[PDB]
Amino acid sequence: FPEWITIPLVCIYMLSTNILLVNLLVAMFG
């Protein structure tokens, strides 16, 4: 349970979720 290696995981998870969400929205409008 190392935090110094946990923080990048949450960072990348949030980045991936945000990029997927924006891609979904833009594709839907198109």
Residues that bind its own copies (CB under 8 A): 22, 26, 28-30
| Residue among 10 and 26 whose Cβ is closer to its own copies | 26
Q: Which is nearer to its own copies, 4 or 29 (CB)?
A: 29
Give the Cα separation of 17 and 10 in Å (integer).
10
Enter the tokens of residue 22: 């924006």
Q: Residue 1 Cβ, how far from its own copies at the closest point, in Å?
A: 30
Beta-carbon-side half-sphere exposure of residue 25 (alpha carbons within 13 Å): 6
Of the pair 9, 28, the CB lying nearest its own copies is at 28
